């Protein structure tokens, strides 16, 4: 009965053209053309991002929503967009990325942007069964969309349930994807986590309108229900008039090489 649940219901009722236009209406998007061409030809020394994820994490990082420091752990790293971004930051000492990378799941990509040598990728790993390890910065970008709000809720609570085990070890910084922050049980879990570990949820402007995803980050503190609903109101407004109008931005280009000595 939350605004977000209403949004999900109306989203599923849109026709093909409206859905297509809607998902990109008034959003920011990084131009991935050059990056994709470089990766497709096997270039590993141009500093291009391995996925759209690098730009998403940069957005949070550049405005203080999450500090990237010391021992970084990336749960559900996929191709490694967040791992490579973190590895290039001077404040980061090491990065451990874990991902399924099997049965259709994206496997870590091998490129040599700055600090690639301080990253340890581990595939064939279900992070829900992975024993928590002590770290300073915890990252998690897991959450598979579902046309069912109940299902998105279940998936989101499972992610937060697992992440809480890791935060309990004591972490300074975190950035965790919250697939369906609009579900009531999720809102309550977020309020509980905020009281225990601080932080709040933030909507990334690079996220498409077809998902209500927001990220639980350590760098700010705000009223969770209020801000989740602000995003619900924005998503609903954009559904009334979908123009498909997108604003293109330059993708992330990282320096290259190993971090040595
Ligand atoms: N009306 C409508 N909704 C759709 C359609 N495809 C997906 N959706 C909705 O949009 C949500 C996100 O789907 P996608 O963007 O295709 O998947 P993604 O993993 O977020 O990328 C789904 O969970 C549905 O609720 C479609 O063809 N029509
Ligand atoms: N239970 C699980 N354990 C490990 N990885 C999982 C998982 N569930 C989903 N994943 C992986 O989590 C990834 C989410 S997409 C992550 C993109 C990454 N942030 C980037 O910047 O490139 C997907 O590859 C998905 O396969």
Coordinates of C-alpha atoms and ligand atoms in Angstrom, one line a residue:
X1 CA 0.0 0.0 0.0
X2 CA 3.1 2.2 -0.1
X3 CA 3.6 4.7 -2.9
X4 CA 6.3 2.4 -4.2
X5 CA 4.0 -0.6 -4.3
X6 CA 1.6 1.4 -6.3
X7 CA 4.4 2.4 -8.7
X8 CA 5.3 -1.2 -9.2
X9 CA 1.8 -2.1 -10.1
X10 CA 1.4 0.7 -12.6
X11 CA 4.8 0.0 -14.1
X12 CA 3.6 -3.5 -15.1
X13 CA 0.6 -2.0 -16.8
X14 CA 2.5 0.2 -19.3
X15 CA 2.5 -0.7 -23.0
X16 CA 5.7 -1.6 -24.8
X17 CA 6.5 1.9 -26.2
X18 CA 5.7 3.6 -22.9
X19 CA 7.8 1.2 -20.9
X20 CA 10.7 1.7 -23.2
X21 CA 10.4 5.5 -23.1
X22 CA 9.7 5.5 -19.4
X23 CA 12.8 3.5 -18.3
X24 CA 15.1 6.2 -19.7
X25 CA 12.9 9.3 -19.1
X26 CA 15.0 12.2 -17.7
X27 CA 17.8 9.9 -16.4
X28 CA 21.6 10.4 -16.7
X29 CA 23.5 7.8 -18.7
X30 CA 27.2 7.4 -19.4
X31 CA 28.2 6.9 -23.0
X32 CA 29.6 3.4 -23.1
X33 CA 30.4 3.3 -26.8
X34 CA 34.1 3.7 -26.7
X35 CA 34.5 1.5 -23.6
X36 CA 32.6 -1.4 -25.1
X37 CA 34.6 -1.2 -28.3
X38 CA 37.9 -1.3 -26.4
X39 CA 36.8 -4.2 -24.3
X40 CA 35.5 -6.1 -27.4
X41 CA 38.9 -5.8 -29.1
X42 CA 40.8 -7.0 -26.1
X43 CA 42.3 -3.7 -24.9
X44 CA 43.2 -3.7 -21.2
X45 CA 45.4 -0.6 -20.9
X46 CA 43.1 2.3 -21.8
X47 CA 41.5 2.8 -18.4
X48 CA 37.9 2.2 -19.6
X49 CA 35.3 0.8 -17.2
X50 CA 34.3 -2.8 -17.5
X51 CA 30.6 -2.0 -16.8
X52 CA 28.2 0.8 -16.1
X53 CA 28.7 0.0 -12.4
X54 CA 32.0 2.0 -12.2
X55 CA 30.1 5.3 -12.9
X56 CA 27.5 4.4 -10.3
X57 CA 30.0 3.9 -7.5
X58 CA 31.9 7.0 -8.7
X59 CA 28.8 9.1 -8.2
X60 CA 28.4 8.0 -4.6
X61 CA 32.1 8.3 -3.9
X62 CA 32.7 11.8 -5.4
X63 CA 30.0 13.3 -3.2
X64 CA 30.9 11.7 0.1
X65 CA 28.1 9.1 0.3
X66 CA 30.7 6.4 0.8
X67 CA 34.4 6.6 1.5
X68 CA 36.5 4.0 -0.1
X69 CA 39.3 3.1 2.3
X70 CA 41.6 0.3 3.4
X71 CA 40.3 -3.3 3.0
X72 CA 37.5 -3.3 0.5
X73 CA 35.1 -6.3 0.1
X74 CA 32.7 -6.3 -2.9
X75 CA 29.9 -8.8 -2.7
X76 CA 28.4 -9.7 -6.0
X77 CA 31.2 -8.1 -8.0
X78 CA 30.1 -9.4 -11.4
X79 CA 32.4 -8.0 -14.1
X80 CA 34.2 -6.0 -11.4
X81 CA 33.2 -2.4 -12.1
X82 CA 33.2 -1.5 -8.4
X83 CA 36.4 -3.4 -7.7
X84 CA 38.3 -1.6 -10.4
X85 CA 37.0 1.8 -9.3
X86 CA 37.9 1.1 -5.6
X87 CA 41.4 -0.3 -6.6
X88 CA 42.3 3.0 -8.3
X89 CA 41.8 5.1 -5.1
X90 CA 44.9 5.9 -3.1
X91 CA 43.1 5.4 0.2
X92 CA 42.3 1.8 -0.7
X93 CA 44.8 -0.9 0.3
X94 CA 43.2 -4.0 -1.1
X95 CA 40.1 -5.3 -2.8
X96 CA 38.4 -8.7 -2.5
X97 CA 35.6 -9.3 -5.0
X98 CA 33.2 -12.3 -4.8
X99 CA 30.6 -13.3 -7.4
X100 CA 28.7 -16.4 -8.7
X101 CA 30.2 -16.1 -12.2
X102 CA 28.4 -19.2 -13.5
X103 CA 25.3 -20.5 -15.1
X104 CA 24.8 -17.3 -17.0
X105 CA 26.1 -15.0 -14.2
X106 CA 28.7 -12.4 -15.3
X107 CA 32.3 -13.4 -14.6
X108 CA 35.0 -11.0 -13.4
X109 CA 36.6 -9.2 -16.4
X110 CA 40.4 -8.8 -16.7
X111 CA 41.7 -5.3 -17.4
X112 CA 44.7 -3.4 -16.1
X113 CA 43.4 -0.1 -14.9
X114 CA 45.2 1.4 -11.8
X115 CA 45.6 -1.1 -9.0
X116 CA 44.3 -4.2 -10.8
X117 CA 47.1 -6.0 -8.9
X118 CA 45.5 -5.3 -5.5
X119 CA 42.3 -7.0 -6.5
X120 CA 41.6 -10.6 -5.7
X121 CA 38.6 -11.9 -7.7
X122 CA 36.8 -15.1 -6.6
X123 CA 34.1 -16.5 -8.7
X124 CA 31.8 -19.6 -8.1
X125 CA 31.0 -18.0 -4.7
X126 CA 27.5 -17.6 -3.3
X127 CA 28.0 -14.6 -0.9
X128 CA 25.0 -15.7 1.2
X129 CA 27.0 -18.7 2.3
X130 CA 30.4 -16.9 2.4
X131 CA 31.8 -16.6 5.9
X132 CA 32.1 -12.9 6.9
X133 CA 35.6 -11.4 6.8
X134 CA 36.7 -8.3 8.6
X135 CA 37.1 -5.2 6.3
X136 CA 36.9 -1.4 6.3
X137 CA 34.7 -0.8 3.3
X138 CA 31.8 -3.1 2.5
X139 CA 30.3 -3.0 -1.0
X140 CA 27.4 -5.0 -2.3
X141 CA 25.5 -4.5 -5.5
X142 CA 23.1 -7.5 -5.5
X143 CA 19.4 -7.4 -6.4
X144 CA 17.6 -9.1 -9.3
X145 CA 14.5 -7.3 -10.5
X146 CA 11.2 -9.1 -10.5
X147 CA 7.8 -8.1 -11.9
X148 CA 6.5 -9.2 -8.4
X149 CA 6.8 -6.6 -5.6
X150 CA 6.6 -9.5 -3.1
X151 CA 9.5 -11.2 -4.8
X152 CA 11.6 -8.0 -4.9
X153 CA 10.8 -7.6 -1.2
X154 CA 12.0 -11.1 -0.4
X155 CA 15.2 -10.7 -2.5
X156 CA 15.9 -7.3 -0.8
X157 CA 15.4 -8.6 2.8
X158 CA 17.7 -11.5 2.0
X159 CA 20.4 -9.2 0.8
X160 CA 20.1 -7.0 3.9
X161 CA 20.0 -10.1 6.1
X162 CA 23.3 -11.3 4.7
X163 CA 24.9 -7.8 4.7
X164 CA 24.1 -7.3 8.4
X165 CA 26.3 -10.3 9.2
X166 CA 29.2 -8.5 7.5
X167 CA 28.5 -5.0 9.0
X168 CA 28.4 -6.7 12.4
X169 CA 32.1 -7.4 12.0
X170 CA 32.7 -3.7 12.3
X171 CA 33.1 -1.7 9.1
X172 CA 33.8 2.0 8.6
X173 CA 32.2 2.5 5.2
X174 CA 29.5 0.7 3.1
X175 CA 27.4 1.0 -0.1
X176 CA 24.7 -1.7 -0.4
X177 CA 22.1 -2.0 -3.1
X178 CA 18.5 -2.1 -1.8
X179 CA 16.5 -3.4 -4.7
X180 CA 13.0 -2.6 -3.3
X181 CA 13.3 0.1 -0.6
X182 CA 9.5 0.7 -1.1
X183 CA 8.4 -2.6 0.5
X184 CA 7.3 -2.1 4.1
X185 CA 9.4 -4.8 5.6
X186 CA 12.4 -3.4 3.9
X187 CA 11.7 0.1 5.2
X188 CA 11.6 -1.3 8.7
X189 CA 14.8 -3.3 8.3
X190 CA 16.5 -0.1 7.0
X191 CA 15.3 1.9 10.0
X192 CA 16.7 -0.8 12.3
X193 CA 20.0 -0.9 10.4
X194 CA 20.3 2.9 10.5
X195 CA 19.9 2.8 14.2
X196 CA 22.6 0.1 14.5
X197 CA 25.1 1.2 11.9
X198 CA 24.1 4.6 10.8
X199 CA 23.8 5.7 7.2
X200 CA 20.7 6.1 5.0
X201 CA 19.4 5.3 1.5
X202 CA 20.2 7.3 -1.6
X203 CA 18.8 7.2 -5.2
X204 CA 21.6 7.2 -7.8
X205 CA 20.7 9.3 -10.8
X206 CA 22.2 6.7 -13.2
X207 CA 19.5 4.2 -12.1
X208 CA 16.8 3.5 -14.7
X209 CA 13.2 4.4 -13.9
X210 CA 12.2 0.8 -14.3
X211 CA 13.7 -0.1 -10.9
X212 CA 13.2 1.5 -7.5
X213 CA 16.7 0.6 -6.4
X214 CA 18.4 2.9 -3.9
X215 CA 21.6 2.3 -2.0
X216 CA 22.2 2.1 1.8
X217 CA 25.3 4.2 2.3
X218 CA 27.4 5.2 5.3
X219 CA 28.2 8.8 4.3
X220 CA 24.8 10.5 5.2
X221 CA 21.9 10.2 7.6
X222 CA 18.4 11.1 6.7
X223 CA 14.7 10.1 7.2
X224 CA 14.4 6.8 5.4
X225 CA 10.7 6.7 4.8
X226 CA 10.6 10.3 3.7
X227 CA 13.4 10.0 1.1
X228 CA 12.2 6.6 -0.2
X229 CA 8.8 8.2 -0.8
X230 CA 10.5 11.2 -2.5
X231 CA 11.9 8.8 -5.0
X232 CA 8.5 7.1 -5.4
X233 CA 7.0 10.4 -6.2
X234 CA 9.7 11.1 -8.8
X235 CA 9.2 7.8 -10.5
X236 CA 5.5 8.2 -10.6
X237 CA 5.8 11.7 -12.1
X238 CA 8.0 10.4 -14.9
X239 CA 5.5 7.7 -15.7
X240 CA 2.7 10.2 -16.5
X241 CA 4.7 11.7 -19.3
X242 CA 7.5 9.4 -20.7
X243 CA 9.7 11.2 -23.2
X244 CA 12.6 8.8 -23.2
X245 CA 14.7 12.0 -23.0
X246 CA 18.2 11.0 -21.7
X247 CA 21.2 13.1 -20.6
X248 CA 24.4 11.6 -21.8
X249 CA 27.6 12.0 -19.6
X250 CA 31.2 11.0 -20.1
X251 CA 31.9 7.5 -18.7
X252 CA 34.7 6.9 -16.2
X253 CA 38.3 6.7 -17.4
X254 CA 40.7 5.5 -14.8
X255 CA 44.5 5.8 -14.8
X256 CA 46.3 2.6 -15.6
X257 CA 49.1 0.3 -14.3
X258 CA 50.0 -1.5 -11.2
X259 CA 50.3 0.0 -7.7
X260 CA 53.8 -1.0 -6.6
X261 CA 56.6 -0.2 -4.1
Ligands
LIG1 N1 5.0 -2.8 -18.6 C1 6.2 -3.5 -18.6 N2 6.9 -3.6 -17.6 C2 8.1 -4.3 -17.8 C3 8.5 -4.8 -19.0 N3 9.8 -5.4 -18.8 C4 10.0 -5.2 -17.5 N4 9.1 -4.5 -16.9 C5 9.1 -4.1 -15.5 O1 10.3 -3.4 -15.2 C6 11.0 -4.2 -14.2 C7 12.5 -4.1 -14.5 O2 12.8 -5.0 -15.6 P1 14.1 -4.7 -16.5 O3 14.6 -3.3 -16.6 O4 13.8 -5.3 -18.0 O5 15.3 -5.7 -15.9 P2 16.5 -5.1 -15.1 O6 17.3 -6.4 -14.4 O7 16.2 -4.1 -14.1 O8 17.5 -4.6 -16.2 C8 10.4 -5.5 -14.2 O9 10.6 -6.2 -12.9 C9 9.0 -5.3 -14.5 O10 8.2 -4.8 -13.3 C10 7.7 -4.7 -20.1 O11 7.9 -5.2 -21.3 N5 6.5 -4.0 -19.9
LIG2 N1 24.3 -14.9 -4.2 C1 25.2 -14.3 -4.9 N2 26.5 -14.5 -4.7 C2 27.5 -14.0 -5.4 N3 27.2 -13.2 -6.5 C3 25.9 -13.0 -6.8 C4 24.9 -13.5 -6.0 N4 23.7 -13.2 -6.5 C5 24.0 -12.4 -7.6 N5 25.3 -12.3 -7.8 C6 26.0 -11.5 -8.8 O1 25.9 -10.1 -8.4 C7 26.2 -9.3 -9.5 C8 25.3 -8.1 -9.5 S1 25.7 -6.8 -10.8 C9 27.2 -6.1 -10.1 C10 27.9 -5.1 -11.0 C11 29.2 -4.5 -10.4 N6 28.8 -3.7 -9.3 C12 29.9 -3.7 -11.5 O2 30.2 -2.6 -11.2 O3 30.2 -4.3 -12.5 C13 25.8 -10.2 -10.7 O4 27.0 -10.6 -11.5 C14 25.2 -11.4 -10.1 O5 25.5 -12.6 -10.8

